[PDB]
Amino acid sequence: PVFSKPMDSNILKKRIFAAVSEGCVEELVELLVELQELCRRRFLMHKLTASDTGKTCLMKALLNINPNTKEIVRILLAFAEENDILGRFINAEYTEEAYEGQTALNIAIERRQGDIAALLIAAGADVNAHAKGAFFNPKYQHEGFYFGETPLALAACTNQPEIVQLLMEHEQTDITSRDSRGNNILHALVTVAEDFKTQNDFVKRMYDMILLRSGNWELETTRNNDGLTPLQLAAKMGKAEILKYILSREIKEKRLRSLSRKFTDWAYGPVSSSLYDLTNVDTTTDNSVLEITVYNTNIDNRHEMLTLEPLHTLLHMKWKKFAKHMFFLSFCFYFFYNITLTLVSYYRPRLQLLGRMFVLIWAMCISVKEGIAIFLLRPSDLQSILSDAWFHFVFFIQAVLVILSVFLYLFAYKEYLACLVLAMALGWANMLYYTRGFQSMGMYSVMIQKVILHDVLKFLFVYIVFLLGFGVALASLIEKCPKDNKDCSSYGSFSDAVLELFKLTIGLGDLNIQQNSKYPILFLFLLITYVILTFVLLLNMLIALMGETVENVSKESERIWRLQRARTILEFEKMLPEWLRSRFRMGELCKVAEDDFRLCLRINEVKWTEWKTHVSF
Amino acid sequence: PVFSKPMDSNILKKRIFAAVSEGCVEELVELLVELQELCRRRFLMHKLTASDTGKTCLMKALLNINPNTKEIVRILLAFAEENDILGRFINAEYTEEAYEGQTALNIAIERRQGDIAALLIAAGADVNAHAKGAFFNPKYQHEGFYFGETPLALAACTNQPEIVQLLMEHEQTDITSRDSRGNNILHALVTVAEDFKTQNDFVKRMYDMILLRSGNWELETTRNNDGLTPLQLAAKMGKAEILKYILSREIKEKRLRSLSRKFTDWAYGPVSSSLYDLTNVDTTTDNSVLEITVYNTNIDNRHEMLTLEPLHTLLHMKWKKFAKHMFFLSFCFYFFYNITLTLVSYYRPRLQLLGRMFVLIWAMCISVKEGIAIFLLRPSDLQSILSDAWFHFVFFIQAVLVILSVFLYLFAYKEYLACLVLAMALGWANMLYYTRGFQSMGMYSVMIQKVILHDVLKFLFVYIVFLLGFGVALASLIEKCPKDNKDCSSYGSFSDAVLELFKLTIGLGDLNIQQNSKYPILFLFLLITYVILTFVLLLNMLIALMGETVENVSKESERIWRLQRARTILEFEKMLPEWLRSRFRMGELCKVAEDDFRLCLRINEVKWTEWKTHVSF
Ligand SMILES: CC(C)C/C=C(\C=O)C(C)C
Ligand SMILES: CC(C)C/C=C(\C=O)C(C)C
């Protein structure tokens, strides 16, 4: 965080700023009387405002607060009344690029002072004046303080509800005012919340106050500049507490029940048949909160908010309804394609040609989907943890290897086997993708990907360094055995010596010690020290590396597997044509409203743990 | 949980239901006067009751409670007094299949209201009216709310004891009333309890109140529809707190001491000689709580309630008395059978025939017990965790292989060795069953079964996929070496290539790189990538998989072993003939009662930790 200029720096007009900084009033009141007539003996009181910055004495007084500050603000404003410049004095604007648009009301609200803040507003302060500075609108979280760039949202982003209540009651205040980010009062509150459960979080408590007092459906429907309602913004930023509050918001009182996203129908002991609203949760529209929350648009907090009631059962009625019947079909139609690819080519000649045609019409079928899936892929997802993109190359590669091989079959480049037989080894290793449909083995394949990434690549990369150095060092010592024979040359070339070192790691071959080295002692010293760096230092410790991996993750392995399946639930859903997606939850109900455009959903909740505890008191 | 119709849906007779729903009375009292004479100008007031459902205004008023509801129920009943239809109005019944039999008293009791509930009962409410609906009687735990289908048990299943106390004092209330499940007031309380220790659990507190006020032995002896006393039902559902309370129930006061299952004889400091009752705990009868609690009829909570005092020492005096003397005999008589099977057949000819006869008369002896044990087995136990059934096939298979082999011995099909020599390898691996009699190694064999199931099968299943794909891929590249010789063909067929890959995993053989591949580079690329998927990715990680297994279980391995032994304690007991089971605990004592049919048991309890803490205050 680097800012070119500071807001307040306590390092003949300087007497104005010095007097208000230390809070001294006696040196100011008599001296302010003197200033009254400098302009007369000379309409535009420049002298009491700074030049390089727009900061005035009013901003200077409030930025350097003290118990004497209240005694200064009242007389400072009275000076502008005599010169009739209170309009320009109160609405004075900062001019630095970092802090631009900050007014005296903005600083008074920040410094936890409802006394002067009410006084300035009553004096004609510019309510809903936007602080459109680079500092107030940081490019990241740590580059500044973003709060919505309005005095109302600043009091809302801070924990001062009294100044909020005063600002709501003001007539000139524009509630549905959008700042330079296209945000709102509710968008700003969503950004400043946190996903970590805090005992005393005012954001969801103040979300209720601002929304209810507005009492209409325009704050929750106003779109962002990127294009995002306050509902969807909480999903993009991963705000679970706000998402749980918004999706399950029930208003008991009349005249405001239209602001409810969940209308409980009936309750009887543990079971209650709540009737939720999903007018912006189902994937019928674009950028749904369900679609946003399952992809890697949220960070480090997905399952704790993918289990929320309106959308936890949205996936179950998508899996148990059409996704399960298409995972088997994808499993069967790929198992048969792999079996046919193996069968018709293991029996290759050194009428079953209709089976070979099936591989032709299906390798193109896989690659046309993978080819179009690569285009929708982005580098922001290609290298990540929950990418689900590595399976998009290897499905494409195994498909593109088959069609490339057969193009060289009839054309007879003799390389038709160099590409086809690599598809068998990859095609059968691709069969492990379709094990997500089982909990016991789907969690197992989750462990494999974490093991193959955190530990195996780190072991191999060190290993080739010990294989390149020791391969060259061992092969360099060996002269050419006489008689021009291939004997004496187990370590004769770099490729021959590296291969013999690799066979030493697994445990295959004979460890000869008289391999025609011109230093027999040095060759053995370099041999009985290679196996203590790999077999004793690395291979045993490789087993040790993965123990930290399978102990920290095993309590989250069942959590990551569900997110894999929940992604394929809607990845399958987008493949259905528009006429096929005519099967949805339920019709329009829950309210007369605007002629009932409320796509509701009835899910009964039988909760035994809470009800048992509730009656226990 | 899916219900076709809702109980209460707040989405010219509709004015009746609307007025009571919102609690408005002014719009009802004058309008109810109007209704009085619609039927006259027209015995059967249909108009104020619903048609598709039996719900009336009384049910509608109580389902939509409000502070004005008490002001509505009193005048609503007075309307039926004038028409003299209070009998049909109060006893009005629901008619939906989901919710059937629900009355106005049932809803009033549910909504924590003892005021109206007492008023309805005083008005002639149908006490002990059964709500025999599909919702009130769910097929599972999450399909509804089961509470015993009576107003008394509903107040008991909820935490309202005042309405219970009122219902006990009523004359018309039938305490020993059985619902559609054959349950009782005490059966229903057992079902709604929980095995997790809760600080404030009313169920065992309300079990005391209902049983004592009844003051007789008919609630604890009334059989279920499945056939189960309230004692045995707590064992089937795994209710440890109720089981600990019931089995150790001591009533101090006279006239009710006959309702005690434990009569403490004397106490002196730490040692107290409690004298328990096991009239339904010992295995003398069928479906004993001891027999039920040791088999896999309880779930996830067995050792925390198999250690309860009446039945923790019931097994110790069965092990130290006849079970230990039959485990050695089973160990010796099977060790000798295995030794004889090995000895008389390792020396097979390429008079000791009496030893061969012993295997004949004992292989049939094993298979006749295993054959009859398979019939008593069920698929509900065949595939489980604490099955103790896998040892029933392999004991049967090893027994059936011996008799099958000798049938081909004299008959001379020459296959007599193909079945007999497989019995040695299985017969000696069966010798590890009889290691349950030792703590150090019995816990070891518990680890093996968990390791062999959670980890080894998951590793092998992935391994054959990498062996099928790489076996075909390696064998496909190899042409037939000239001269029609068997050289050049280490990977010549599928079986030859798969075998050479398996030997690569363990570490046997020579890793040749010039194995007559028509692509020497591609064969090596497919070879130095198979060993990084098994030897580097799988075999090392296999060791890693079992580390989560031996760290989470080792604190429970000593717990599962006891349940294995406790099952064989009564598995041995059922083998004794009726005359042999003439040795039991102790006679009839502890009370005069009904001519003393109380099979008691005296077990002295020397408790030093509690007594030391008790005197410390
Ligand atoms: C390209 C062939 C060598 C198969 C490659 C793999 C599968 O075995 C990788 C993905 C592990
Ligand atoms: C043997 C390979 C194919 C396993 C590696 C993966 C597949 O599961 C990726 C996803 C890490």
Ligand SMILES: CC(C)C/C=C(\C=O)C(C)C
């Ligand atoms: C049938 C023979 C091969 C013995 C089989 C086993 C014992 O070694 C299995 C039970 C592990």
Ligand SMILES: CC(C)C/C=C(\C=O)C(C)C
């Ligand atoms: C070598 C085998 C016989 C071990 C496996 C078992 C026996 O202990 C079953 C019970 C898992």
